[PDB]
Amino acid sequence: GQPHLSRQDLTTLDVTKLTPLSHEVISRQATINIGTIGHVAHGKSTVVKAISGVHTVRFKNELERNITIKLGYANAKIYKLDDPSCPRPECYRSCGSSTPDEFPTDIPGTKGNFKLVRHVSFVDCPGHDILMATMLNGAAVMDAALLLIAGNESCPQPQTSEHLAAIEIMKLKHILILQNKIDLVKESQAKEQYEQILAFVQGTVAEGAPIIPISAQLKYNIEVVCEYIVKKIPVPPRDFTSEPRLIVIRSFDVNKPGCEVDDLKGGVAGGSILKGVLKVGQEIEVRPGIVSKDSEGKLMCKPIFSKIVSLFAEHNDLQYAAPGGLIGVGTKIDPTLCRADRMVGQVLGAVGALPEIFTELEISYFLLRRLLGVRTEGDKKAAKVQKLSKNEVLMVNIGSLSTGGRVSAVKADLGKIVLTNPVCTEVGEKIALSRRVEKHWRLIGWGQIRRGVTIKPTVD
């Protein structure tokens, strides 16, 4: 629906032929996810801003909810110069997602038009909710990592151990290390910092990883990062054949105040696609949909049936959506149900192809006992993780589906969790747990859904 980009046609579309490196899909939306495991004040946001430019966000709410939990995404197109005269990594260039598939060279590289290679999405969180977001479910949250260490400090900083513990627990095999803020660092200082870094990562998953030094503010050696994304990062395997599923992360009401009747639109639901391809005009079911209570106070759920009016990927308009980024499905649902992120925590998929709606879970949890990679300074009990107690509110994080939960009973290691709102899942899924230590939610263990109380979705 937008010019200067590869045409998308539903008729000339086959799910089996679709691959993560397909030019048609990459031309409009990102296909792979590379979470940046860094830290604020160290260039965590600056690196992503330099790589992917500056975004504008098509739809934004007046009030931001769960800003410390939201899994932010940032799309970046990486291109390669076809002229062999231009030396690497200058042939590799990063830019925004709105650029055309080919643009003429802006450098004196003796001609040669740049061609789109890949489209990446940076899974960045203001905290560490990434850990229990992706630590046992797996799904397709990401397949790479960007461990960031600044240069002014000396490795290992007290904020580094948690990052390495996160890299280990995520079971990520593809990690790239970016030494930021090394511009104001002497050569000997940089060398000794690199030596400390390799000593710290000795015997860990970050053994065979690049230690690329970059300067985010001045945009130095970003092309090296793009090159290692091209080469070091392998193509993840994705399943485009199954019925599509999307975990709803955002939700907007796009109708401006004082708009005409003919200009009314449905509810736009942003989210992440796990497995399948969404098509415009496809009948979709959102579960648990409308959750209400009886006169006596009994939970009941009515799944919301609708049709995909349109699909958006950042500023681009799509005809079919594939996993590998934040896709916003504009639908026919009433804006009342999708205003101010009121549909977050729901699963949107093909009709009759959604998991069961649970209100309570019976999980087999393995409780952690010290916070991962934390320095216990003074207070030895601060890093200790207490045992689960009755009437304690945890944070169950099934993949990207966040939900609260009150522990009702623990026998030996089988804990019953009463969710605040019913969620769609299946028996045997890997879930994680979090606890409010102070000012934050911190991972304290994981488990499996042995059993659970389900609720029958009433349909009229």
Binding site: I182, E187, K191, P213, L218, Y220, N221, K232
Partner: peptide, 24 residues
Amino acid sequence: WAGSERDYTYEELLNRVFNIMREK
């Protein structure tokens, strides 16, 4: 400067960056 189809080392990137701020 060379046919580095293989992965580099930290030294070459570091001296590249250092050349960058020393020349400008």
